[PDB]
């Protein structure tokens, strides 16, 4: 029985920004803040404020707010970055900066002679090579750029078989540290995609089980 062997790489981009809070979590945060203020002893700022307020009140018959106003006006003058870098675009699904709250994975379109597959990045190696180094070589070559990929474990993550003679695909999970994608205007259809859009995109039953080991978050 002839056997074909093949590796594949699931690249995860860590979220840059924290997810928003459920209203239940917001209520719990308010409760925790209130009880922490209640159980708290005193702060130097509020102690000085109350002391100064009492001192002026007693001296009138015989600062802290200014510093608070200065801090407030400095904060209002300073402007933070835009958390929603995708809501303004709504067009590019291929950008590394598409989503910041969820993990992203890369899907690349390949149209072969007998198959037109929306395929996760696969590889090929001769029996003298190793799966992990094969994945590293694949991310170095097929990605035509400089990525900094942090592999989690030497052991695989997913294993799928198809019999025509058979073939096997071994998915290893890797993490993105810092990448400089050159030639973003190329015709190679590379898309950064989340959990739900991944489920929308991936048609085959073999690639429909990547979600089995991929984190839902």
């Amino acid at each position: 029985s002839p056997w074909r062997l093949l590796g594949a790489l699931c690249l995860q981009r860590p979220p840059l920004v924290t997810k928003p809070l459920t209203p239940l979590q917001e209520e719990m945060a308010d409760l925790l803040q209130q009880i922490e203020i209640e159980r708290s002893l005193y702060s130097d700022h509020e102690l000085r404020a109350l002391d100064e307020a009492q001192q002026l009140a007693k001296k009138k018959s015989d600062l802290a707010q200014d510093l608070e106003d200065m801090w407030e006006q400095k904060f209002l003058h300073f402007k933070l970055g835009a958390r929603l870098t995708e809501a303004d675009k709504k067009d590019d699904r291929t950008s590394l900066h598409r989503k910041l709250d969820r993990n992203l994975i890369l899907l690349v379109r390949e149209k072969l002679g007998d198959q037109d597959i929306w395929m996760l990045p696969q590889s090929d190696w001769q029996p003298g090579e190793t799966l992990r180094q094969t994945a590293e070589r694949t991310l170095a070559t097929l990605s035509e750029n400089n990525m900094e990929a942090k592999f989690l474990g030497n052991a695989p993550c997913g294993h799928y078989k198809f019999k025509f003679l058979g073939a096997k695909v071994f998915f290893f999970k890797a993490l993105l540290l810092t990448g400089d994608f050159s030639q973003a205007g190329k015709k190679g259809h590379h898309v950064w995609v989340s959990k739900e859009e991944l489920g929308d995109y991936l048609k085959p039953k073999y690639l429909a089980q990547v979600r089995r080991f991929l984190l839902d978050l």
Binding site: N103, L152, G153, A155
Partner: protein, 155 residues
């Protein structure tokens, strides 16, 4: 009694035993003890995440060797005020380190564990996963000026 069939019914000292080099054998890669460092400016956040990882280790049948806190480090912010040629005190920032010391683990469960940890990292908390070495062991300990000065006299 010794000749009676009920001998040794009260034997209990064998039930309680109360009186690290990694084991790298290739396939059962049961390596050595590891430090999970959690560095944060928020003391409560660092403590909460250390508690969470400790409970996760307890649930996942991980032999937690220790769960300690390293000495604090108080950075002082000296900002240069406008027009320059000066330097004024802005604030003080106390960074805190909580370290969970685990005993043994495998490659598979290490991958899964690390995946869970960096999926569940809070905001503004630096993760570190290192092997336990003499430098990491002496980090908790104070310097030895007498030993250092004598060694200088020797050299």
């Amino acid at each position: 009694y010794r000749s009676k069939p009920t001998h040794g019914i009260g034997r209990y000292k064998h039930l309680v035993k109360a009186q690290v080099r990694p084991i790298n054998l290739g396939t059962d890669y049961e390596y050595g003890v590891l430090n999970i460092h959690l560095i944060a400016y928020d003391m409560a956040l660092a403590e909460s995440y250390a508690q969470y990882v400790h409970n996760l280790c307890n649930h996942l049948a991980i032999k937690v060797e220790e769960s300690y806190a390293m000495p604090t480090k108080t950075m002082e912010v000296l900002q240069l005020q406008e027009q320059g040629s000066k330097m004024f005190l802005d604030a003080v920032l106390t960074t805190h380190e909580r370290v969970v010391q685990i005993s043994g683990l495998s490659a598979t469960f290490a991958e899964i564990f690390l995946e869970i940890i960096h999926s569940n990292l809070p905001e503004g908390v630096k993760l570190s996963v290192r092997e336990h070495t003499e430098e990491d062991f002496k980090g908790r300990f104070k310097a030895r000026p007498e030993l250092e000065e004598l060694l200088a006299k020797l050299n």
